[PDB]
Short mmCIF file of C-alpha atoms in Angstrom, two decimals:
data_model
loop_
_atom_site.label_atom_id
_atom_site.label_comp_id
_atom_site.label_asym_id
_atom_site.label_seq_id
_atom_site.Cartn_x
_atom_site.Cartn_y
_atom_site.Cartn_z
CA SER A 1 -6.05 18.53 -19.40
CA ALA A 2 -7.21 20.52 -22.43
CA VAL A 3 -8.12 23.64 -20.45
CA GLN A 4 -4.70 23.71 -18.80
CA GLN A 5 -2.94 23.50 -22.16
CA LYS A 6 -4.93 26.51 -23.39
CA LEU A 7 -4.25 28.42 -20.17
CA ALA A 8 -0.54 27.65 -20.52
CA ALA A 9 -0.64 28.92 -24.11
CA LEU A 10 -2.51 32.04 -23.01
CA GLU A 11 0.14 32.63 -20.35
CA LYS A 12 2.97 32.16 -22.84
CA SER A 13 1.37 34.61 -25.26
CA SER A 14 0.99 37.20 -22.48
CA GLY A 15 4.57 37.31 -21.22
CA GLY A 16 3.43 37.20 -17.60
CA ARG A 17 2.56 34.74 -14.83
CA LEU A 18 -1.06 33.57 -14.70
CA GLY A 19 -2.82 31.91 -11.79
CA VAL A 20 -6.30 30.42 -12.12
CA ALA A 21 -8.54 28.52 -9.76
CA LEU A 22 -12.03 27.39 -10.68
CA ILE A 23 -14.43 25.65 -8.32
CA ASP A 24 -17.52 24.15 -9.93
CA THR A 25 -20.00 23.82 -7.07
CA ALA A 26 -21.91 21.15 -9.01
CA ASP A 27 -19.42 18.35 -8.23
CA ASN A 28 -16.82 20.29 -6.18
CA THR A 29 -14.36 19.71 -9.00
CA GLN A 30 -11.52 22.20 -9.32
CA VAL A 31 -9.44 23.45 -12.23
CA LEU A 32 -6.09 24.89 -11.14
CA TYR A 33 -3.30 26.67 -12.97
CA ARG A 34 -0.39 27.69 -10.73
CA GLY A 35 -3.03 27.19 -8.06
CA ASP A 36 -0.51 27.01 -5.19
CA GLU A 37 1.78 29.86 -6.25
CA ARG A 38 1.58 33.14 -4.39
CA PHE A 39 0.33 36.23 -6.21
CA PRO A 40 -0.04 39.80 -4.99
CA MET A 41 -3.68 40.25 -4.05
CA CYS A 42 -3.86 44.02 -4.53
CA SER A 43 -7.48 45.15 -4.22
CA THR A 44 -8.88 41.61 -4.20
CA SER A 45 -7.88 41.72 -0.52
CA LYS A 46 -10.74 44.16 0.07
CA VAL A 47 -13.17 41.24 0.01
CA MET A 48 -11.54 39.79 3.13
CA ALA A 49 -11.63 43.12 5.00
CA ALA A 50 -15.29 43.67 4.16
CA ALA A 51 -16.14 40.10 5.16
CA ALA A 52 -14.27 40.51 8.43
CA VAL A 53 -16.36 43.56 9.30
CA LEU A 54 -19.50 41.68 8.27
CA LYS A 55 -18.49 38.91 10.68
CA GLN A 56 -18.16 41.46 13.50
CA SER A 57 -21.68 42.69 12.74
CA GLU A 58 -23.09 39.25 13.61
CA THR A 59 -22.58 40.21 17.26
CA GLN A 60 -22.55 44.03 16.99
CA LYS A 61 -25.88 44.28 15.21
CA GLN A 62 -25.65 48.02 14.52
CA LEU A 63 -21.99 47.98 13.47
CA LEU A 64 -22.65 48.63 9.80
CA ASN A 65 -24.49 51.86 10.64
CA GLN A 66 -21.62 53.20 12.74
CA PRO A 67 -20.46 56.53 11.27
CA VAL A 68 -16.74 56.83 10.57
CA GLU A 69 -15.06 60.18 10.00
CA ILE A 70 -13.35 60.85 6.69
CA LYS A 71 -10.57 63.38 7.30
CA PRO A 72 -8.29 64.92 4.65
CA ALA A 73 -5.38 63.01 6.22
CA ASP A 74 -7.21 59.73 5.53
CA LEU A 75 -7.18 60.17 1.75
CA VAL A 76 -4.62 58.12 -0.15
CA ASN A 77 -3.99 57.60 -3.86
CA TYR A 78 -7.43 56.44 -5.09
CA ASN A 79 -10.54 57.51 -3.16
CA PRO A 80 -13.43 57.92 -5.63
CA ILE A 81 -16.12 57.64 -2.95
CA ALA A 82 -14.31 58.81 0.18
CA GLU A 83 -13.37 62.04 -1.63
CA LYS A 84 -17.10 62.80 -1.82
CA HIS A 85 -17.39 62.70 1.98
CA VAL A 86 -14.25 64.48 3.21
CA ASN A 87 -14.90 66.28 6.52
CA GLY A 88 -18.06 64.21 6.78
CA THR A 89 -18.78 60.62 7.73
CA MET A 90 -19.51 57.34 6.04
CA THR A 91 -21.00 54.31 7.72
CA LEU A 92 -19.09 51.05 7.78
CA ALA A 93 -21.65 49.71 5.31
CA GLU A 94 -20.97 52.66 2.98
CA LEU A 95 -17.22 52.16 3.40
CA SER A 96 -17.55 48.43 2.67
CA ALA A 97 -19.58 49.11 -0.46
CA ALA A 98 -17.10 51.74 -1.58
CA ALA A 99 -14.14 49.42 -1.00
CA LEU A 100 -15.81 46.60 -2.89
CA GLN A 101 -17.72 48.30 -5.69
CA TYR A 102 -15.40 51.22 -6.47
CA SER A 103 -12.14 49.80 -5.06
CA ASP A 104 -11.85 52.88 -2.84
CA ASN A 105 -8.50 52.73 -1.02
CA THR A 106 -9.42 55.09 1.82
CA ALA A 107 -12.44 52.88 2.48
CA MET A 108 -10.15 49.84 2.68
CA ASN A 109 -7.90 51.59 5.18
CA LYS A 110 -10.89 52.39 7.41
CA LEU A 111 -11.97 48.75 7.30
CA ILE A 112 -8.45 47.69 8.26
CA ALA A 113 -8.50 50.20 11.13
CA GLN A 114 -11.83 48.81 12.34
CA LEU A 115 -10.26 45.35 12.48
CA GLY A 116 -7.24 46.50 14.46
CA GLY A 117 -4.70 46.52 11.66
CA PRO A 118 -3.72 44.18 8.83
CA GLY A 119 -3.23 41.49 11.47
CA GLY A 120 -6.95 41.70 12.19
CA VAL A 121 -7.81 41.03 8.56
CA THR A 122 -5.40 38.11 8.42
CA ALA A 123 -6.90 36.82 11.69
CA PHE A 124 -10.32 36.58 10.09
CA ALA A 125 -8.85 34.57 7.21
CA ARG A 126 -7.34 32.14 9.71
CA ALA A 127 -10.63 31.94 11.59
CA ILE A 128 -12.48 30.72 8.49
CA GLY A 129 -9.77 28.19 7.63
CA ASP A 130 -7.61 30.19 5.20
CA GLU A 131 -4.03 29.57 6.31
CA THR A 132 -2.61 31.12 3.12
CA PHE A 133 -4.00 34.66 2.91
CA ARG A 134 -1.77 37.26 4.48
CA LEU A 135 -2.36 40.98 4.66
CA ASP A 136 0.72 42.84 5.83
CA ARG A 137 0.28 46.45 4.76
CA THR A 138 -2.36 49.12 4.32
CA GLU A 139 -3.27 51.05 1.19
CA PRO A 140 -1.56 51.95 -1.03
CA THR A 141 1.70 50.11 -0.25
CA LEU A 142 0.05 46.70 -0.27
CA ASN A 143 0.00 46.98 -4.08
CA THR A 144 3.77 47.03 -4.66
CA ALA A 145 3.54 43.46 -6.06
CA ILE A 146 7.29 42.92 -5.89
CA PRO A 147 8.30 39.57 -7.43
CA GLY A 148 9.01 37.03 -4.70
CA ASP A 149 7.72 39.25 -1.89
CA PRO A 150 5.28 37.18 0.21
CA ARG A 151 3.62 40.24 1.76
CA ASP A 152 -0.03 40.80 0.84
CA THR A 153 -0.30 37.60 -1.17
CA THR A 154 -2.45 34.55 -1.42
CA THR A 155 -2.72 31.63 -3.80
CA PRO A 156 -5.47 31.06 -6.37
CA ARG A 157 -6.52 27.83 -4.67
CA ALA A 158 -6.83 29.45 -1.26
CA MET A 159 -8.70 32.51 -2.50
CA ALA A 160 -11.15 30.42 -4.52
CA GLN A 161 -11.93 28.24 -1.52
CA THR A 162 -12.30 31.27 0.74
CA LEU A 163 -14.49 33.20 -1.70
CA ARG A 164 -16.68 30.11 -1.97
CA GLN A 165 -17.09 29.97 1.81
CA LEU A 166 -17.88 33.68 2.15
CA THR A 167 -20.51 33.90 -0.59
CA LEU A 168 -21.98 30.44 -1.18
CA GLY A 169 -20.94 28.78 2.08
CA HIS A 170 -21.77 29.75 5.63
CA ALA A 171 -18.63 31.41 6.92
CA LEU A 172 -20.90 34.43 7.45
CA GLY A 173 -24.41 34.71 8.85
CA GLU A 174 -27.31 34.68 6.42
CA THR A 175 -27.88 38.44 6.34
CA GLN A 176 -24.13 39.10 6.08
CA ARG A 177 -23.61 36.58 3.26
CA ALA A 178 -26.46 38.09 1.26
CA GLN A 179 -25.03 41.57 1.80
CA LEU A 180 -21.62 40.46 0.53
CA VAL A 181 -23.21 38.86 -2.54
CA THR A 182 -25.21 42.02 -3.24
CA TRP A 183 -22.07 44.16 -2.96
CA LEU A 184 -20.06 41.91 -5.30
CA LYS A 185 -22.83 41.81 -7.89
CA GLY A 186 -22.87 45.61 -7.88
CA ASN A 187 -19.16 45.91 -8.60
CA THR A 188 -18.48 48.67 -11.11
CA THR A 189 -14.85 47.89 -12.04
CA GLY A 190 -15.10 44.42 -13.56
CA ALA A 191 -16.59 44.86 -17.02
CA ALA A 192 -13.31 44.24 -18.88
CA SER A 193 -12.08 41.37 -16.70
CA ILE A 194 -13.70 37.99 -15.92
CA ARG A 195 -17.12 39.33 -17.00
CA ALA A 196 -15.83 40.05 -20.51
CA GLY A 197 -15.00 36.39 -21.16
CA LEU A 198 -18.30 34.93 -19.98
CA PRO A 199 -21.72 34.63 -21.65
CA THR A 200 -23.75 37.80 -21.15
CA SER A 201 -26.62 35.86 -19.56
CA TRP A 202 -24.48 34.71 -16.62
CA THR A 203 -24.61 36.87 -13.50
CA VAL A 204 -21.23 37.72 -11.97
CA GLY A 205 -20.17 39.25 -8.69
CA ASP A 206 -16.49 40.09 -8.69
CA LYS A 207 -13.69 42.11 -7.14
CA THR A 208 -10.84 43.30 -9.33
CA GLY A 209 -7.35 44.18 -8.25
CA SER A 210 -4.45 45.91 -9.89
CA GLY A 211 -1.01 46.96 -8.81
CA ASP A 212 2.57 47.44 -9.82
CA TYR A 213 4.31 44.90 -12.06
CA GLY A 214 1.22 45.02 -14.28
CA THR A 215 -0.62 42.99 -11.68
CA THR A 216 -4.18 42.42 -12.90
CA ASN A 217 -6.53 40.30 -10.81
CA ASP A 218 -10.18 39.40 -10.59
CA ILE A 219 -12.04 37.08 -8.26
CA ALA A 220 -15.60 36.18 -9.05
CA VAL A 221 -18.65 34.21 -8.07
CA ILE A 222 -20.55 33.17 -11.19
CA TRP A 223 -24.17 32.08 -11.40
CA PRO A 224 -24.80 30.46 -14.79
CA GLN A 225 -28.39 30.20 -15.96
CA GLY A 226 -29.78 26.83 -14.89
CA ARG A 227 -26.47 25.57 -13.51
CA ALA A 228 -24.67 25.37 -10.19
CA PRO A 229 -22.64 28.51 -9.43
CA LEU A 230 -18.92 28.72 -10.06
CA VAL A 231 -16.10 30.46 -8.22
CA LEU A 232 -13.28 31.71 -10.44
CA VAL A 233 -10.04 33.42 -9.40
CA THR A 234 -7.68 34.83 -12.04
CA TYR A 235 -4.39 36.37 -10.94
CA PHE A 236 -1.86 37.82 -13.35
CA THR A 237 1.43 39.60 -12.85
CA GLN A 238 4.30 40.63 -15.10
CA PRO A 239 8.10 41.00 -15.01
CA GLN A 240 8.29 44.78 -15.54
CA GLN A 241 7.46 47.17 -12.70
CA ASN A 242 5.60 49.67 -14.91
CA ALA A 243 3.92 47.03 -17.09
CA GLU A 244 0.42 47.96 -18.23
CA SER A 245 -2.66 46.21 -16.90
CA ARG A 246 -3.82 43.20 -18.90
CA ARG A 247 -7.50 42.75 -18.11
CA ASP A 248 -7.84 40.99 -21.48
CA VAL A 249 -5.81 38.11 -20.09
CA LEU A 250 -8.35 37.61 -17.32
CA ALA A 251 -11.19 37.79 -19.84
CA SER A 252 -9.46 35.20 -22.01
CA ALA A 253 -8.78 32.93 -19.05
CA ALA A 254 -12.46 33.08 -18.13
CA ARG A 255 -13.44 32.31 -21.73
CA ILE A 256 -11.13 29.28 -21.79
CA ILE A 257 -12.62 28.06 -18.49
CA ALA A 258 -16.18 28.66 -19.70
CA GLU A 259 -15.46 26.48 -22.75
CA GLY A 260 -15.31 23.52 -20.34
#
């Protein structure tokens, strides 16, 4: 198709490996580019951890208000929100918001702990029909993004279908789904990624991810004005370990998609 030729050209110009999956919820049509190749998820995996905790709260009604200690030993490499509460507590709701909206890595590790380890996050993926997602490590080592390493990867197709189910589908209860959507819409880290390639009137909820090998990711739910919502996943990784992030590639991918 025309969009796939432009995405291929974008990829060639970038020097990296680009993975795109679009789901248009109007006709359930999909646009895929390397849609079945594995990419390192990096912080886009935080959506699955937050959703898993939301799923637990459908039975444990007060779970999101449960205070969790933040100790100095819990801090890892990037803890913008958790740093503000060292030797204090944060609720699981506050930790989920911090993980999603600020990409706080300590918050992610507390969510993983609440689920019983990375295997508990992966379990939730399997329970909602995602046989592709795998979380193997905690923060920050899950971001190593080593070429060919299957750990902590998913495919664009699988992540797009799963993000659809979590936010626009009914994999979560009604209150939980709305909470996830609210969190994603309040993301603070996405302005230069998918959002930058889309018309300013469209409302976006997204989760970015970045890692070694210049890995630059964004997954988004998009509500166009007077049009069925879209789900767009853009994964990008590069051959050099210390390569710089390329959020512009995600913005350009989104712009190419939005042209259709």
